[PDB]
Nucleic acid binder design. Structure first.
Ligand SMILES: [Mg+2]
Ligand SMILES: [Zn+2]
Lengths: 57, 55, 257, 33, 89, 101, 166
RNA sequence: AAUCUAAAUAAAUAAUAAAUUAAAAUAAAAAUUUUAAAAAAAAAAAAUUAAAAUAGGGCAAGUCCUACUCUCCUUU
RNA sequence: AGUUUAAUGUUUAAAUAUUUAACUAGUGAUGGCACAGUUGUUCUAUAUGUACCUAUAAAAAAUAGUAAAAUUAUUUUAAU
């Protein structure tokens, strides 16, 4: 099981306090906050985002 | 303690007027004209001049 | 209402008025009594500085009064000072009255008899015209290094009307603790009552030996066994008093020669 | 006598036997400086 | 903290650092990896920790100055002996 | 404590026992009691006779240090050297007193 | 001869190294001492970092004539350790040419340092290692050119609201 | 009534996945409720989080130990 | 005035201490050396025989898949 650490290891630089300092809590946070974006983005962002465009027109 | 505290928990410690007033306050002072040493008011030396007339 | 709102007994606080109310209990709210073992934060009680027991506190009230009389200044610390100055205004209230009731009511209280022999002689002469506030409570500045207890300098009032401490200086303590205190040079021409300065060197005589210079050497081993930082080894604690410091004083007793 | 040499091994000298003899007429040594 | 109603950025080198001190990078085979590229200028000048006097209170000179600092209540024991018999080699 | 800062000092050494300065050997001459003996009465019996006792370690004196010479327990505390004549004369049973044959 | 590459004209030059790092160690030194600063590190200040350091952030950014004052008053240990420097550092600063008066405290930071391990013997056969802590004290006296040393000879503000108007 | 401050100093322990959520109310669905959801909106005490340790159960496989008309050797 | 109780203590100053109740009369017993592990000793409680008697110490790979804890290398290319 490969946590893609070197793909997240340099991106904790924009998390907040405890996540940046320690690694096994830093990854766990981002590899979740990343794991929910790319799940929010595929199935949920449109049917929200395409409702601002409908509420506008 | 059933949890460790992130800094934002340790940092709230430093906002109340209990931390500030205990550690982070500068004392008001002035130069004892007789001893030329810094001094607070209401306190004097063990010395005749400092003890007869409070500098 | 008809009964007191707070019945017979309840401790109000430090910083609270008397709020007199009909009650069976007895409260002084006045402390004109001399040399009294009424220590407390109330009104009719002098401040109870901390100690192991109201007995041991009374034992601290003895060696801190008999050392203010012995040498007119004692650098006392914390809530002992407001508790001592009221014992310096009592000793004079005991030394002024004079009757052989009082001279014992202080004899019961002082660890040493020469003090009750002193207090009754200088103080009637000294404070013949002062009628209250005989002790001056001037606070030293640097809080103790061993704890933040404050250090007040309680000294008896006017000494220029004294007979024992006429023109002494207290800007600094005696060099070896058995050496008499430095004198103001403007009044260097002062001699003392003999019974005061002949009994002193009787006491100061034991530290001028070598058996105390062994108890001095030794003590520095205790404070290291108990490890106390910054205590020189008993191998470089060369004596306080010595033969070179002998020659001056036997020739400083030229009066009896 | 025992001690630690600058290296660190405890280099204890051989043991001996103080024998305080007591002569009749006292003896002395002079040292001119 | 500090802050005099002024947003000085914060407590400087203090509050956050004292939370997880960084593990010390160990040498492999005693090698320093980029030794053969970085210059030989004394490290006092490399990252910037350039100090005019590095006074050292771990010294027999300043033993009086250390004993000047510590609190009288800070009793230190075993001044004239040690619990472990020092004469065992 | 007239210190203003307590310590291993300014702890008034004897705030009692004001009758100092005892000339023991001088007084021991009046009692005719072996001046070397009388002075031993007034120090813990560990220090003079061959008795089980507890010594402080600084009292023992250190090896020759780089800072200080070898300070033996005697040359710093002369009046604490045990006197084993005075021990034996007083405390131990001599062969003489029980010699039977 | 080891060469360290430097660029001079857009191309890099295989310049000798022993002569290149002797040019740094003289330049970086000359680029550091000609400053109006004075950095001074006291080490093994016998105090933990939690304590010692929070008593520094009161001093960070104070004139040394004030810092040497706010230190001598407070009975804390952190203020007595730094005051040990502010009399030694300025004692060395005045040699560098730095002013005795206009000198400031630029950065006064605590540096985590050596930590002994002492055996502690808790009750009921449990042990827990007490670690006697010690820190390092990094102090950079800088020089403020226009710093007006305020007159401190009037009782803090007994000069008013305690003295009657006129 | 007594003795057991704060502060200054030295600096350990259980526990620690995280928290910005935690509150609070209501329904739940397998459960005690906790979640999910909706909808809100410094110091003492021990109501909740594990304020507890550790006892209390009963089941499973494993071993233990004691007992006698029915099993079996080393057996004196 | 050290011991059948009770309070405190509850990682405690103690891997049993502080205070205290009770008890206390031993010419028959804290004690010379003597008994040792399928066994000693037992005024017998399956109690103890060096601070859990399941003795210590030592030597094994016993069994533990039969609901214990684990079993290390992303971007794949046929289903139940
Ligand atoms: Mg999409
Ligand atoms: Zn002064």
């Amino acid at each position: 099981y490969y946590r893609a650490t070197a793909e997240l290891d340099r991106l904790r630089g924009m998390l907040r306090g405890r996540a940046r300092l320690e690694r096994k809590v830093g990854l766990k946070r981002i590899t979740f906050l990343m794991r929910t974006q790319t799940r929010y983005r595929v199935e949920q962002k449109a049917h929200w985002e395409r409702a601002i465009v409908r509420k506008n027109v | 303690p059933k949890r460790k505290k992130n800094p934002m928990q340790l940092r709230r410690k430093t906002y109340g007027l209990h931390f500030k007033e205990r550690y982070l306050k500068l004392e008001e002072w002035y130069f004892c004209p007789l001893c030329a040493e810094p001094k607070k008011q209401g306190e004097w030396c063990r010395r005749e001049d400092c003890r007869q007339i409070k500098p | 209402g008809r009964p007191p709102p707070v019945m017979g007994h309840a401790k109000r606080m430090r910083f609270a008025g008397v709020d007199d109310n009909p009650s069976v209990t007895h409260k002084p709210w006045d402390t004109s009594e001399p040399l009294m073992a009424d220590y407390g934060w109330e009104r009719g009680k002098l401040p109870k500085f901390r100690a192991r027991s109201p007995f041991h506190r009374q034992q601290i009230a003895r060696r801190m009064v008999t050392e203010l009389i012995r040498k007119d200044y004692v650098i006392v610390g914390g809530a002992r000072a407001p508790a001592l100055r009221i014992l310096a205004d009592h000793v004079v209230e005991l030394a002024k009255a004079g009757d052989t009731d009082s001279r014992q009511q202080l004899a019961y209280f002082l660890h040493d008899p020469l003090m009750v022999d002193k207090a009754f002689d200088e103080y009637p002469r000294r404070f013949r015209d002062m009628n209250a506030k005989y002790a001056m409570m001037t606070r030293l500045k640097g809080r103790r290094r061993s704890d933040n207890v404050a250090m007040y300098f309680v000294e008896y009032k006017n000494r220029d009307m004294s007979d024992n401490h006429k023109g002494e200086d207290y800007t600094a303590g005696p060099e070896r603790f058995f050496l008499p205190p430095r004198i103001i040079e403007t009044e260097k021409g002062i001699q003392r009552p003999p019974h005061m300065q002949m009994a002193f060197d009787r006491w100061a005589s034991k530290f001028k030996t070598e058996e105390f210079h062994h108890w001095w050497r030794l003590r520095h081993a205790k404070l290291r066994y108990w490890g106390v930082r910054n205590v020189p080894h008993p191998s470089d604690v060369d004596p306080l008093w010595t033969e070179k410091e002998e020659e001056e004083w036997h020739n400083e007793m030229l009066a009896n020669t | 006598r025992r001690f630690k040499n600058e290296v660190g091994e405890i280099k204890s000298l051989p043991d001996y036997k103080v024998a305080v003899v007591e002569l009749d007429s006292p003896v002395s040594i002079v040292f001119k400086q | 903290f500090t802050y005099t109603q002024a947003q000085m950025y914060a407590r400087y080198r203090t509050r956050s650092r004292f939370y997880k001190r960084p593990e010390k990078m160990l040498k492999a085979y005693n090698v320093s990896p980029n030794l053969l590229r970085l210059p030989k200028v004394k490290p006092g000048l490399l990252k910037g920790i350039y100090t005019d006097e590095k006074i050292d209170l771990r010294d027999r000179e300043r033993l009086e100055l250390v004993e000047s600092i510590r609190h009288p209540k800070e009793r230190d024991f075993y001044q004239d002996h040690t619990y472990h018999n020092q004469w065992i080699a | 404590y007239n210190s203003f800062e307590r310590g291993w000092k300014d702890k008034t050494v004897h705030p009692l026992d004001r009758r100092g300065r005892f000339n023991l050997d001088e007084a021991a001459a009046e009692l005719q009691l072996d001046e070397a003996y009388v002075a031993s009465l007034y120090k813990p019996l560990h220090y003079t006779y061959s008795m089980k006792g507890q010594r402080y370690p600084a009292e023992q004196g250190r090896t020759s240090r780089p800072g200080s010479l070898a300070a033996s327990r005697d040359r710093m505390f002369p009046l604490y050297r045990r006197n084993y004549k005075l021990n034996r004369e007083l405390r131990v049973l001599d062969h003489r007193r029980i010699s039977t044959d | 001869d080891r060469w360290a590459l430097v660029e001079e004209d857009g191309v890099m030059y295989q310049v000798n190294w022993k002569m290149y790092c002797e040019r740094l160690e003289t330049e970086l030194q000359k680029a550091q001492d000609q400053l109006p600063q004075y950095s001074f590190m006291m080490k093994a200040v016998p105090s933990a970092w939690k304590k010692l350091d929070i008593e520094l952030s009161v001093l960070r950014g104070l004139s040394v004539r004030e810092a040497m004052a706010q230190c001598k008053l407070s009975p804390r240990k952190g203020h007595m350790a730094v005051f040990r420097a502010l009399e030694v550092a300025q004692q060395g600063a005045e040699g560098k040419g730095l002013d005795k008066e206009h000198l400031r405290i630029a950065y006064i930071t605590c540096m985590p340092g050596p930590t002994d391990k002492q055996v502690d013997i808790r009750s009921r056969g449990y042990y827990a290692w007490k670690t006697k802590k010690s820190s390092h004290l990094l102090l950079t006296l800088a020089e403020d050119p226009e710093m007006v040393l305020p007159d401190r000879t009037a009782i803090p503000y007994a000069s008013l609201m305690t003295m009657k108007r006129a």
